[PDB]
């Protein structure tokens, strides 16, 4: 599996638009929000919420959770071929779905909330979760093989009041599924040392800021800590979910995260939703005591607002940013790939980027510099020995004043010229 290891102004990445595969009807005129794209083996899970009207508050038309195969579409280009689609009854109660694939089934764990987004109405949230299993290769049946919902006998959340899936994709190890998650911890019970917060090189930074921005506001009742939710299929007739907190090395507010096998090992990515705006991801050293050997990356960051803009590294009170994940594609050189919004303070201009810790190797702009965009989900795999990445990129449609997900399949280039 050989790819260019040299920085090169050449336009050697040539992405293909394969969004036609997904269930997006542009002609409907609808906003498509809350996307999820998970790929493992030859299979993928996909989800979105389709709205008539504004993306924030237009009326929900449908929530889709679908699974299928990633196949060579006929010309050595991968496409998504959806085979099994479930529309949740009561679309408005389903939030924060996360997907892990094991043994011919994709399992999606979703928060259920009749009080709104659990992150925003967190003290009133029931805490209840739903686990849905979808066959990737369905079969003619009279019951639930193709789709059924499971019983979570218990939820072991430890000292947290509430735990929740929080991010698109997880991993399997044996029969144990690990979803990216977040724990809600009462702020008064959050033990932290202000001296630890890194204000040494920052003149306007204050010691309180790191603790204060572990919540969505300085006076939030809860703080959010990222982690994993563990589901051992080979454990009782109805298994329990067990929350597993992330280590406190390079701690940031709990945010949409992702854990993925790449080249034989799990990698963890955490979105930077506050002041540590440099990309947070790296090899998982241990899963159950979750500790991530974070990359010390000096080139990739995300756009923010005025308080925590791109390239900010000084502690600050802020809850802003965008989920732009990255996929390791060569562990010998630690080269990774992702789509990043190449702007300091506005959510615009998606650029597909192949990069090292201290160097962007090569890039393709997928749209114009003025083109508004948001969430980005990248997944890479082999197709007949070719490293391919499929990136979902939320892009703004100025004609309908809405946002819609576009899919790019991008072959990583073997040769720099």
């Amino acid at each position: 599996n050989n790819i260019c290891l040299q920085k090169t102004s050449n336009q050697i990445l040539k992405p293909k638009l394969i969004s036609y595969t997904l269930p997006v009807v542009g002609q409907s005129g609808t906003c498509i929000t809350d996307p999820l794209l998970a790929m493992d083996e030859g299979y993928f899970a996909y989800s979105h919420l389709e709205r008539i009207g504004s993306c924030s508050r237009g009326v929900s038309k449908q929530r889709i959770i679908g699974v299928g195969e990633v196949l060579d579409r006929g010309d050595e280009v991968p496409s998504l071929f959806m085979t099994n689609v479930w529309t949740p009854p009561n679309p408005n109660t389903v939030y924060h779905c996360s997907a892990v694939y094991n043994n011919e089934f994709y399992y999606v764990l979703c928060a259920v909330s009749t009080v709104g987004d659990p992150i925003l109405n967190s003290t009133y949230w029931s805490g209840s979760l739903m686990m849905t299993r979808l066959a990737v290769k369905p079969k003619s049946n009279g019951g639930g093989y193709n789709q059924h919902q499971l019983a979570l006998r218990s939820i072991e959340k430890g000292r947290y009041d509430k735990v929740m899936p929080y991010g698109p994709s997880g991993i399997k190890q044996g029969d144990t599924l690990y979803f990216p998650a977040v724990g809600f911890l009462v702020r008064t019970e959050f033990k932290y040392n202000d001296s630890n917060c890194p204000i040494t090189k920052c003149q306007y930074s204050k010691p309180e800021n790191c603790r204060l921005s572990m919540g969505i506001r300085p006076n939030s009742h809860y703080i959010l800590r990222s982690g994993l939710l563990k589901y051992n299929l080979s454990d009782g007739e109805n298994p329990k979910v067990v929350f597993i907190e992330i280590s406190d090395q390079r701690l940031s507010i709990g945010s949409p995260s992702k854990i993925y096998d790449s080249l034989g090992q799990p990698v963890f990515y955490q979105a930077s939703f506050s002041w540590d705006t440099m990309i947070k991801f790296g090899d998982v050293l241990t899963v159950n005591p979750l500790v991530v050997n974070w990359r010390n990356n000096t080139v990739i960051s995300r756009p923010g607002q005025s308080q925590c803009p791109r390239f900010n590294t000084c502690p600050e009170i802020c809850w802003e940013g965008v989920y732009n994940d990255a996929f390791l594609i060569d562990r010998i050189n630690w080269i990774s790939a992702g789509v990043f919004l190449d702007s300091n303070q506005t959510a615009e201009n998606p650029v597909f980027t192949v990069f090292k810790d201290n160097e962007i190797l090569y890039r393709a702009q997928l749209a114009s510099e003025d083109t508004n965009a948001q969430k980005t989900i990248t997944n890479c795999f082999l197709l007949k020995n070719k490293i391919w990445c499929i990136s979902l990129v939320e892009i703004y449609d100025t004609g309908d004043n809405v946002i819609r997900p576009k899919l790019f399949a991008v072959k990583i280039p073997e040769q720099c010229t």
Epitope: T30, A347, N401
Partner: antibody, heavy 116, light 113 residues
Framework: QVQLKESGPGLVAPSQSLSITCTVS????????ISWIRQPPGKGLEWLGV???????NYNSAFLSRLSISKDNSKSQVFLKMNSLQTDDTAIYYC??????????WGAGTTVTVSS | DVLMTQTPLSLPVSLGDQASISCRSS???????????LEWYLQKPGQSPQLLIY???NRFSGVPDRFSGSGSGTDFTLKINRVEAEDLGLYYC?????????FGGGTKLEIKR
């Protein structure tokens, strides 16, 4: 108690820049999109820009060179910045809350006068 | 870039009579979603504008039933039957089917007494 409150400078010299801070109460900036509207004195209402819950920003084409909209989710503050201000710019400036492409709630407005 | 024209700059009306304001859009205002986002707002003296009608004929929460929006294509009218004194002010139509959103020039309702 859902309210939008606008703090502005009152007076702005020609060619210098206008900065307004809107503090929002009873709602989450992540929950609702926020838009900026201005009334020129005597003259009718005009729409300048919107900041989405995600942070996507959409602006009137006319003010795109001179207008920036930003938000702090943690401090519940939305910020409007404008540049190269002129007498035509003098107006009451409104921070508005949007539901389904309609303005449900409106700030009281801040009066901005361009003058030396 | 989509222009909204309000036909009566000034409307004088007696109490209990019916006031009728017109709004023309320079283009079709139907969205791909198939909803026409035409809204009517009132500004009473001394106050910020407030929403009356959205999606052509829907009364915003709290608006009395004597306020009424109709329209088709590019012609919209708001009717206030049994006009009450507290109705006096400035009425604006507004479209959010196209960015940039645009307002009409306004209509001042005056009460004949």
């Amino acid at each position: 108690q859902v309210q939008l409150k606008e703090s502005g400078p009152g007076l702005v010299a020609p060619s210098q820049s206008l900065s307004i801070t809107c503090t929002v109460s009873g709602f989450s900036l992540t929950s609702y999109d926020i838009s900026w509207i201005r009334q020129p004195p005597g003259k009718g209402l005009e729409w300048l820009g919107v900041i989405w819950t995600g942070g996507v920003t959409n602006y009137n084409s006319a003010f795109l060179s001179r207008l920036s909209i930003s938000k702090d989710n943690s401090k519940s503050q939305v910020f409007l910045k404008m540049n190269s201000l002129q007498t035509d710019d003098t107006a009451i400036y409104y921070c508005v809350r949007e539901g389904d492409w309609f303005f449900d709630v409106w700030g009281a407005g801040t009066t901005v006068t361009v003058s030396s | 870039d989509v222009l909204m024209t309000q036909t009566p700059l000034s409307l004088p009306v007696s109490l209990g009579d019916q006031a009728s304001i017109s709004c023309r859009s320079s283009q079709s205002i139907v969205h791909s979603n198939g909803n026409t986002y035409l809204e009517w707002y009132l500004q009473k003296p001394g106050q910020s504008p407030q929403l009356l009608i959205y999606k052509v004929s829907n009364r915003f929460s709290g608006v009395p039933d004597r306020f009424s929006g109709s329209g088709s294509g590019t012609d919209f009218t708001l009717k206030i039957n049994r006009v009450e004194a507290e109705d006096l002010g400035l009425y604006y139509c507004f479209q959010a089917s196209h960015v940039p959103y645009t307002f009409g020039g306004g209509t001042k309702l005056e009460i004949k007494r």
